[PDB]
Design a protein around this ligand. Structure first.
Ligand SMILES: Nc1ncnc2c1ncn2[C@@H]1O[C@H](COP(=O)(O)OP(=O)(O)O)[C@@H](O)[C@H]1O
Ligand SMILES: Nc1ncnc2c1ncn2[C@@H]1O[C@H](COP(=O)(O)OP(=O)(O)O)[C@@H](O)[C@H]1O
Ligand SMILES: Nc1ncnc2c1ncn2[C@@H]1O[C@H](COP(=O)(O)OP(=O)(O)O)[C@@H](O)[C@H]1O
Ligand SMILES: Nc1ncnc2c1ncn2[C@@H]1O[C@H](COP(=O)(O)OP(=O)(O)O)[C@@H](O)[C@H]1O
Ligand SMILES: N[C@@H](CCC(=O)N[C@@H](CS)C(=O)NCC(=O)O)C(=O)O
Ligand SMILES: N[C@@H](CCC(=O)N[C@@H](CS)C(=O)NCC(=O)O)C(=O)O
Ligand SMILES: N[C@@H](CCC(=O)N[C@@H](CS)C(=O)NCC(=O)O)C(=O)O
Ligand SMILES: N[C@@H](CCC(=O)N[C@@H](CS)C(=O)NCC(=O)O)C(=O)O
Ligand SMILES: [Mg+2]
Ligand SMILES: [Mg+2]
Ligand SMILES: [Mg+2]
Ligand SMILES: [Mg+2]
Ligand SMILES: [Mg+2]
Ligand SMILES: [Mg+2]
Ligand SMILES: [Mg+2]
Ligand SMILES: [Mg+2]
Lengths: 314, 314, 314, 314
């Protein structure tokens, strides 16, 4: 059968109602694949051979017991046909070291979703620099002076870190905010770290849309994430409310401009974030929102993904 | 003329007797290039255009005053013909973010020494995994159990981090050492970070040889670094004593097996570390030892480097 | 009744077989006290009044369910008669900030076990400086030069941090160890942090004895902790094997020399560590070993503690 | 003569125009004291005896060369009559460990300015809890829920950390600020660290007054620090503009209510911060502003301090 491996954060701590790695494993099992579970500490390199202690996994939609390990073994990763790299951000050096280990298996012919070299090339915030015609005004800098000047030009800005996801450290500096100085000292760590500033997009009130792309093809329904109450963050992670919608026509236009690059670079499962008609980030590590969209519409995103994996393995 | 830029750690704090970035700038000036100085905080991205505040530099071998800035300007980095990325390790995410900024200039046709994509692909310790036939026995793992077992098989091991240089955190765990447990808990941070173990190479007593490669071509004399007194580290940084030597015949054999890969990947200036006949690491960020070799032998390594840059620009 | 509060690490994550805070709560409940549970985040200060969100607790020796909250409330801490500060190390600034909050309640007449001012005065490693006649040779320094010289004088030394417990970072540097330099650079963080060196005590082979002192009175049986296998640490936390013993006559002599100071300073429940006839540290924050001693001998340490609390409240 | 020691941050890096430790050393030298210079790494403990490598210091108001060491020696600290602890914040555990070392010298009869036990008892922000009748409304908490509620009650609040000085991390959350959530997640590190909230005091527009107290006696002129431009921080450190003034009558009233406690606790040199008629913090580690006040008025604060030291030594 196909043997699929998954590197992910502890399965014992996921919420199977929302988790997309889990929805993918139910579909792989429904198709008859042998599932091999791994966490970051299980992978290693011995004389350049990527190997791992895996546990053969069995999953089921049961809220008392959703997984069971039916055996364990140490194998070379080149023994698996597909490895899904579903480790959550932050993008740190540990994450990078794991992609070199996954890359030694990929040279022995294992398919890696997503491709290790592209995970290091395409940072979720800075890859927008390759599509500046679709993004808001974006400045990446360490200097408070440049941040102050971008604020004076735009009046209302969003300042963010480059490594997190889920609304980690998002500040909005509107007109008359008394805190530009301390927010820049906090995000650049007194000018020793880069941060990103973007002009604020009022359309966030209509939702931050997560648009999913399966091997360059946009899935036709998205999830708009509406910030809630006293929150500047649309992220479900920061309490945002999700609303499944068909793609609007500027959603198709952005997703098709990016689609071919993602295919070309082996970024087989990608989550675009679109606010209004601007692209704000590209999630290539562990994008979610599969469950919410799939509940509301007749589309099997996990099926699309396994179909694309199986074509890639032919 | 050629306009060469350099991104480096503060020039006001270098030792011009030992520093190789400085020796390279004296040669570029001797050839008539216009030098533009940058530090990491000067580079930025505004709508995907890489730009920087540079300072036009003038250097001279004077220990009271070795540099002067004769002007400053904000320019797009694509205005320079060559940028030397000479920032010192650690390999951290800031270093990675800078390579995406240098990569936007490289797409507009600037030559980057070394190539930004290869700086992210070739970590100084883990790139040895692509030449395991030339390295010692090497294990990269988070698990103390695997480290203990590698120690029982080899008796005498070297344990190290993956990010530093200069002898940062090198432990030797010889037979009967009472500390394997606490050294593994310290380097893997209780199993949450990968570390590297290698079998100890007795030949370190004859020196850790720094072998320099200029665009795939090995420079014919090396510097052997001899550990001093009560030191397990050969590194000049950890007090090692340097001895310039001709390359021996296994030095030629290793350097030629790696030479073509480095050329192919745009790793134009590389420092190999060889102990005996084993490759232990590949320094691609800011390798030094140019001064010491050049003092003792009739070879101009900086000249070789500018000749290779000028060929690359043709 | 007496209302006793406890500040501790999450009760949902303790092992009731070994945990001493839990054994103390079963005894307080057996005596009829009302138990109020708190974690560090529940305590606060509003205009200098110490207050907390507590949860009224019910505990029982049941491995499926060992606690239940039967209500919650926000109260001033001065409403409780006794607060047991049982938060585990590290000794960090958060720990110190909590002692000022517990100190505002103590001025309104609540008994704090142990006394907040003494928790800040008596660091578990450096308080041994007030009894240097009972300790091994001890040097606290940031300088590798002094560490090297102490090693040359003593041949076999133990190097440790000042903040942890449980065998955190204990190195033994015996004769001919190739790592003094990197161990000193690691514990002093290149000379910016103090560490402690002590001469190694061969008697650790007979056990690191935990001697418990209840209001200056030594409990008459101790637990010797024997290091296991390839371990330099006797700590149960680092796999040490515990053996309950009567106190030997040098155990009585040390415990009585320290007894009156601990009483005097309101350090009502203290865990001395004795190796042979030398005192190595004084645990005043959350000392354990009550269960193991009590299983083997006819002594109720928790009873001694509640008797001392009740006398203190008279 | 009197031998005075000073523990301070590197003298080679101070600005003698503004630095108050330096102004104190010129006065001690003018009186004929022998000055012994120390940095944190020079102090150590060997079997509970506090000792240090000192350098005999000579200072002079010369901007090319303001200090010279005329010898060095290792001595027990009990050999000095007075040690000025002038190390700058942060208040971290290293700072605390140094106070135990200074405390072993103090038991052998050395005067420590300020007293080590009081430096650990009187944190610069939380010691205000002992004078809540003179401070603004102050909440110290880890819970965002309590911070949100304090903001709804007061409309305009100041949120700050407990460890820094100089305007480190001061946020103002006025009505309609879109960032309460991310500022609380940032200062409490997702609820794992305490932070302080206070209601905003409009009077900061007239200056944050530094009021100096020499052994319980208020010095009669203060320095008001006016925030500048786009700054919420009055601190000279964050660009604030200083204006020497006589004490107003509510400045006398606050300083006299605190004066006797500071004397009583051996906090011989203290810098109160007063905004309007509210006390906001008490700087006991390294308060400055001596130069600016002394330039404008006929008062020798350093003289007052040496007079108080000499009385303390009688
Ligand atoms: N330019 C913007 N305009 C408005 N809101 C933005 C903007 N950029 C980010 N945000 C807000 O911050 C949240 C997270 O931003 P995002 O770029 O997607 O980073 P993250 O990885 O944390 O999700 C968004 O959902 C939105 O609420
Ligand atoms: N396998 C080995 N055998 C012996 N010594 C080694 C070995 N690996 C590293 N070392 C020692 O540690 C020093 C640094 O090792 P290296 O791999 O080059 O890391 P770094 O980047 O810090 O220079 C070497 O100069 C040598 O002294
Ligand atoms: N002087 C010493 N001689 C021998 N072993 C020691 C010595 N000091 C510490 N140790 C070892 O390290 C372990 C922990 O040391 P300790 O001082 O008690 O710190 P901790 O708080 O981590 O328990 C001890 O149980 C013992 O095994
Ligand atoms: N309650 C307050 N009202 C207004 N401004 C305040 C208040 N508390 C602090 N600040 C501002 O922040 C600056 C620093 O606050 P402070 O409490 O003195 O901390 P620090 O140690 O950093 O000086 C003050 O100078 C002032 O500008
Ligand atoms: N691993 C998780 C996803 C974790 C996560 O937060 N992922 C980010 C991108 S890496 C995301 O898609 N967040 C969507 C949101 O917060 O709305 C899952 O599969 O559910
Ligand atoms: N930037 C410095 C080099 C800094 C450095 O230590 N570089 C490492 C590799 S990134 C090195 O070559 N070290 C040689 C040694 O310590 O012997 C220079 O040009 O001199
Ligand atoms: N809170 C825990 C104790 C946690 C702990 O490890 N405490 C240290 C001192 S703070 C200890 O006594 N350790 C004994 C050992 O490891 O043997 C309990 O009550 O069991
Ligand atoms: N050590 C320095 C003082 C460093 C410092 O910033 N101290 C703080 C208190 S610890 C201070 O008084 N700051 C006054 C201000 O920034 O206005 C000196 O003597 O000048
Ligand atoms: Mg994201
Ligand atoms: Mg997003
Ligand atoms: Mg190196
Ligand atoms: Mg090396
Ligand atoms: Mg302990
Ligand atoms: Mg101990
Ligand atoms: Mg202050
Ligand atoms: Mg202040």
């Amino acid at each position: 059968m196909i043997k699929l491996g998954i590197v992910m954060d502890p399965i014992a701590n996921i919420n199977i109602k929302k988790d997309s790695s889990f929805a993918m494993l139910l579909e792989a099992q429904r198709r008859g694949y042998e599932l091999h579970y791994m966490e970051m500490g299980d992978l290693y390199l011995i004389n350049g051979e990527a190997r791992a202690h895996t546990r053969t996994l069995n999953v089921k939609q049961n809220y008392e017991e959703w997984f069971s390990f039916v055996g364990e073994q140490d194998l070379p990763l080149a023994d698996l046909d597909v490895i899904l790299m579903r480790k959550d951000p932050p993008f740190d050096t540990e994450f990078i070291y794991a992609t070199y280990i996954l890359e030694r298996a990929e040279e022995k012919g294992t398919l890696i979703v997503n491709k290790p070299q592209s995970l290091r090339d395409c940072n979720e915030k800075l890859f927008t620099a390759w599509f500046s015609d679709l993004t808001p005004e974006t400045l990446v800098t360490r200097n408070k002076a440049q941040l102050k000047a971008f604020w004076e030009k735009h009046s209302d800005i969003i300042l963010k870190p480059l490594d997190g996801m889920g609304g980690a450290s998002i500040f909005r500096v509107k007109e008359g905010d008394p805190n530009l100085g301390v927010i820049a000292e906090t995000l650049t760590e007194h000018g020793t770290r880069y941060c990103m500033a973007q002009n604020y997009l009022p359309a966030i009130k209509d939702g931050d849309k997560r648009v999913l792309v399966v091997d360059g093809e946009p899935v036709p329904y998205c999830l708009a994430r509406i910030p809630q109450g006293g929150e500047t963050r649309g992220n479900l992670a920061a309490g945002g409310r999700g609303e499944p919608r068909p793609l609007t026509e500027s959603d198709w236009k952005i997703a098709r401009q990016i689609g071919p690059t993602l295919k070309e670079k082996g970024l087989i499962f990608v989550g675009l974030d679109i606010i209004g008609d601007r692209l704000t980030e590209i999630n290539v590590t562990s994008p979610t929102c599969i469950r919410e969209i799939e509940a509301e519409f007749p589309v099997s995103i996990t099926g699309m993904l396994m179909d694309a994996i199986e074509a890639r393995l032919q």
